[PDB]
Every structure is written in structure tokens, then in C-alpha cells.
Ligand SMILES: O=C(O)[C@]1(O)C[C@H](O)[C@@H](O)[C@H]([C@H](O)[C@H](O)CO)O1
Ligand SMILES: O=C(O)[C@]1(O)C[C@H](O)[C@@H](O)[C@H]([C@H](O)[C@H](O)CO)O1
């Protein structure tokens with residue numbers, strides 16, 4: 261598995277199943293999966309930062325990012341590739357050393373430029389085929405955790421060590 | 424695929440899995456799927472208006488339609504066939520030039536009259552046999568996206584063009 | 587199918603997948619499936635009343651029974667067999683003309699005494715084996731509708747006649 | 750195997766790991782009524798049930814109360830420690846505890862109890878620690894599955910309680 265210095269992740273359709281709950285009062289919900297917090301745990305255990313790119317902008321994601329101690333949160337992003345290219349510049353790494361997981365049209369250009377691209381099994385076929393690794397899980401099922409554990413080559417030895 | 428000039432759609436059981444969330448206070452929820460927003464994207468990409476016809480009337484659907492910039496919204500509809508005729512009559516459009524997706528008893532008369540009828544895989548057998556194209560997805564799983572993409576013949580080159 | 591004069595149904599695990607959403611403030615949610623309203627439609631189309639029996643007692647179910655025009659709503663029920671018995675006395679019918687659907691321990695006694703017992707596929711095996719008809723669907727998937735349509739022999743003819 | 754105490758994780762056991770956030774700082778969990786049958790059988794056989802969770806919410810406190818769970822420990826940092834405390838207090842060994850958990854912070858405890866349960870949904874390196882097979886995933890009534898297996902609940906038990 262190639263060398264990774266940064267893990268970037270989309271939210272809707274990755275950390276969730278794409279679900280957007282609306283009530284009558286203008287409030288909104290997302291459903292996260294606690295399993296994906298272990299994706300953060302593994303990244304941080306390995307000294308690798310995690311950044312969230314999303315084109316939505318919600319208090320929902322702000323609070324979830326905070327809860328998970330995510331290193332970067334970029335909301336209302338319209339150009340995901342530009343966002344990553346710039347974060348890479350500030351870190352002095354290149355796209356070949358980023359792992360990005362996304363599921364939709366707005367992710368495609370970034371998925372095509374990164375060192376390892378991941379797309380959940382639930383995503384449209386034309387995005388899915390941009391994946392450079394196989395992911396079994398659908399969004400909301402812990403696919404971000406699956407992506408991280410693959411990208412970082414997390415194995416049983418690592419598991420024994422942390423416990 | 425025949426020429427389509429208007430895409431119409433039901434909400435519950437199509438944009439959702441039929442889920443209706445009630446609380447203790449009289450509030451109400453629906454769970455939408457961000458994937459279906461690509462249905463609108465593609466429609467608008469090909470210059471095709473989208474309309475929602477629903478028998479329910481909620482602030483939920485009003486706000487959702489607004490967020491997705493849906494072109495026509497009709498709520499509290501008792502006669503979906505009449506509502507589609509009236510909209511179509513305004514636009515100069517024939518029911519044969521309409522693609523409509525619905526999932527239950529109240530959608531049947533319209534489904535039998537449109538140029539392309541779609542029904543999610545989750546729908547009662549009586550309704551699903553009215554579908555004139557095959558849809559794999561269930562309500563809430565992005566079946567509206569699926570419907571639009573097939574109706575408009577969205578292919579890999581369309582995908583390559585928009586990114 | 588035998589002659590049925592009353593359809594009775596549990597809520598949790600039948601009309602829902604057994605899910606109970608709790609927030610931080612003491613509020614509560616259930617998720618109903620709009621599909622199950624067709625169960626009430628078909629029952630009423632055949633001149634058969636529907637009654638809810640549940641051990642829970644919530645505003646949630648109160649609203650749902652109202653929205654669906656359910657004929658009878660009994661909540662906080664500690665003994666479902668008795669509750670069904672007095673309602674049967676009150677209506678001048680007996681248990682053999684009742685169709686009941688339930689999914690758990692508190693339903694067991696009533697299920698053994700009704701003319702047609704239904705249990706969702708999702709239920710424990712010891713309850714499931716009391717079903718007197720096969721139900722394919724799980725609670726929350728529209729299994730109440732499946733039950734009513736099977737109990738009343740709803741066929742394509744019936745569908746064609748009501749659209 | 751002879752059991753004196755059933756302990757259980759929450760998220761990913763009593764739920765599918767789902768955490769709902771709204772825009773206002775509120776939070777939800779989805780429980781399954783099926784799992785209350787877990788408490789029912791436990792109490793029926795005179796076995797107490799305790800909840801160990803690393804989270805801390807009103808959500809769980811209210812669910813535990815509603816289900817009349819015997820023990821509740823939230824914001825737990827070290828689940829092994831929490832369980833030993835309870836075992837010492839009860840005058841029992843971990844060998845007489847059946848525990849079900851689903852993730853890293855359950856591993857230590859899972860490897861020490863007499864019967865360890867892990868939902869089908871759990872990551873594989875946790876799942877392999879299970880000492881009995883559980884078919885069900887978190888949130889599908891897997892706590893009930895566990896109790897029923899651990900206590901050997903059979904049809905005769907069902908006939909008796911009905
Ligand atoms: O389940 C509901 O809340 C209900 O209002 C009940 C009503 O009996 C039924 O006709 C409608 C219809 O299924 C929806 O309006 C379609 O959107 O649904
Ligand atoms: O999960 C619940 O909150 C609970 O109240 C717990 C209770 O111990 C159980 O017996 C009931 C019963 O399963 C429901 O009432 C079914 O409607 O459910």
C-alpha cells in the first residue's frame with residue numbers, strides 16, 4: 261500500500277447513507293455511525309491527519325467533526341480538488357499522498373487525482389469505477405472506517421497492540 | 424427512450440422508503456436521500472422541468488422541493504391524473520411526453536397514462552406491473568435518480584462531460 | 587380464507603421494525619410506513635373494522651391511529667387476549683372471526699386464539715411459529731398491509747375496480 | 750455455561766451504531782423493543798443486567814430506566830475495570846459474566862468474561878473474540894439473541910411464561 265500523508269473524506273453518502281431527515285420546523289438531521297470514529301482513531305494512531313470536505317454546510321457536521329476531533333473541516337466547498345490541492349500545499353505533500361473517499365459527481369475530479377481513491381459500494385456506478393481500491397461497505401455502514409483500515413493497512417497485530 | 428418534456432414524481436415511497444416519523448408533540452419527519460438531488464441535476468442539465476405531485480401536504484416536502492429547486496410543487500393532490508393534465512395543459516405538453524414515477528394506489532391512473540411510468544422495486548405488485556421500465560432501486564434508495572437517469576438516457580459520456 | 591369480521595394489530599414490530607428513537611429531552615419517535623395505510627383502506631373497502639392493541643401508550647400512536655382512521659385504539663394494554671375478548675363481546679363476534687397480527691411475547695395468547703394469526707418474518711421464532719398464514723415482510727416493511735391483503739384475499743380484480 | 754451477570758455495551762449492540770444529530774445540539778439513538786425481551790428473560794431467570802457505555806447521554810439513562818436495567822455505567826473509560834468492580838461487589842468472577850460489546854474499547858473485557866458475545870455487524874477483529882455465534886447485527890435485537898442463547902431459553906420456557 262502506497263505512502264499516505266493525508267486522508268480526506270466526503271460526508272453524505274460516506275459517513276451517512278445519503279439520508280437527510282427534514283421535520284416541519286426547518287430543523288435537519290444526519291445519521292452518523294459510531295464505527296467510523298475508529299477510522300479517525302486509526303488515522304491518528306498512525307500519525308495521519310483527517311480532513312472533511314463537504315459542499316453542504318451544517319451545524320450537524322460541525323458538531324460531529326468536533327466530537328471526532330477531526331483535524332480539518334471544510335464546509336460549503338464547491339471545488340473539492342482545489343480545496344485538497346491547497347491543503348496539500350500548506351502541508352507540503354502532493355495529491356499522490358492523499359487518500360480520498362467520496363460518493364458523488366462533485367467528488368469525481370478529486371477522486372481521479374489522489375493516490376488512493378475510495379467510493380462506497382452504494383455510490384453510482386460512474387463514481388464507483390473511479391475507486392482504486394475495493395470497498396464492500398455502503399455509506400452509513402462504517403465505510404469510512406473500512407477505507408481508513410485498508411488505506412493504512414490496519415491488521416490484527418495493530419489491534420493486539422492497541423489493546 | 425421516447426421524447427420526454429416533463430418529469431413528474433410522487434414523494435412517499437419514491438423519494439422515501441415510505442417512512443413517516445411521528446414524535447410525541449405533533450412534529451413529523453421524512454428521510455430523503457441526497458442521491459435523488461442528482462435526478463434534478465440531470466433533468467435540468469437536459470433542459471427538462473421536474474414536478475412533484477403528492478397527496479400529503481407538509482412543510483417537510485415544501486422545504487425539500489425548495490432546496491432542490493424543483494420546478495413545480497403540488498401538495499394535497501386528490502387526483503394525481505387531473506393535476507398532471509392541468510400542469511401539462513399549461514405547458515403545452517402531452518401525457519405521452521411525461522415520465523412519472525409513483526408507488527401506490529393513488530398513482531395508478533396517472534402511471535397508466537404517461538409516456539414512461541416508473542415504479543420502485545419496493546412497491547406493491549399491482550403497482551409495479553404498471554411500470555414501463557425496470558427500476559432496481561427501492562423507495563428512498565435513490566430510485567428517483569435511477570428513474571431520471573434511465574428516462575433521459577444518462578450515460579458515461581454525459582458523466583464525463585459534466586465533470 | 588375464513589370469514590373475518592375484525593382485524594386487530596399490534597404496533598411495535600408490526601407497524602414499525604420495533605424501533606424506538608429517544609432524544610436528549612424525553613421526546614420519543616416511531617417510524618411508520620405509509621404502505622400500511624393501504625391495510626386500513628382495504629379493510630374499510632370490505633366493511634371490516636380495524637383495531638389497534640398495544641402495551642405502550644403514546645401520543646405517537648394516538649396521532650397515527652387518527653391519521654389512519656383506525657376504528658379502535660386500545661393502548662396501555664396489559665392483557666391483549668382479554669382486551670380482544672371484550673371488544674369481541676361488545677361487537678357480537680367471536681375470536682374465530684378475528685384476524686390478529688403481532689410479533690412478541692405479549693401477543694402470544696391472543697395469537698393462539700384468533701381465527702387467523704399473523705406474525706412478521708422479523709419476529710422471534712417462538713412467536714413466528716404461531717402464525718397461521720405465511721407473511722414474507724418484516725415489521726415496518728408494510729407487513730400490516732401484506733396481512734390485510736392476504737386475510738381479505740385482495741386480488742388484481744379488486745385493484746382494477748378501485749382505480 | 751453458568752452465568753451470574755449479563756453486561757452489555759450500547760452503541761452497535763442495542764443500536765446499529767447510529768447517532769442522529771440535529772442542527773440544535775440534540776441527539777438521538779434508535780433502540781429496538783425486541784431487546785427489552787432480553788431484560789425480561791434475564792430477570793425471569795434471576796439474572797441481573799448491567800449497561801457499560803463509553804458515551805454519556807440522557808438518551809441511555811431514560812432507556813435503562815424504562816427497561817429497569819439493574820446497573821448503569823456511562824462515560825466509562827475502562828470497561829474491564831468497571832466490570833471487575835461490579836464482580837468484586839457481587840462476589841463473582843468474570844468467569845460468571847456474559848458480556849456483549851462491538852468495538853475496540855470492549856475487547857479487553859470481552860477476552861476476560863465467561864461468555865463473550867459480539868454482534869454480526871462488528872469489525873472482524875472484535876467479532877472473532879465472541880465465544881458464541883450471534884446471527885444478528887447491532888440494533889436488530891442482538892442483545893435479546895445473546896440473552897436467550899446465554900440463558901438457554903427454549904420453547905418450554907416460552908410455553909411456561911405464556
Ligand atoms: O400514511 C399516511 O399518512 C396517509 O396519509 C394515509 C392515507 O390513508 C393514504 O392515502 C396516504 C397516502 O398513502 C399518502 O398520502 C401518499 O403520500 O397516506
Ligand atoms: O421497549 C420498551 O420500551 C418496552 O416498554 C419495554 C417493556 O419491557 C416491553 O415489554 C415492552 C413491549 O415490548 C412493548 O410495549 C411492545 O409494544 O416494551
Ligand SMILES: [Mg+2]
Nearest residue numbers: 272273363364
Ligand atoms: Mg456525498
Ligand SMILES: [Mg+2]
Nearest residue numbers: 433435436526
Ligand atoms: Mg407514494
Ligand SMILES: [Mg+2]
Nearest residue numbers: 596598599689
Ligand atoms: Mg410488537
Ligand SMILES: [Mg+2]
Nearest residue numbers: 758760761851
Ligand atoms: Mg459499541
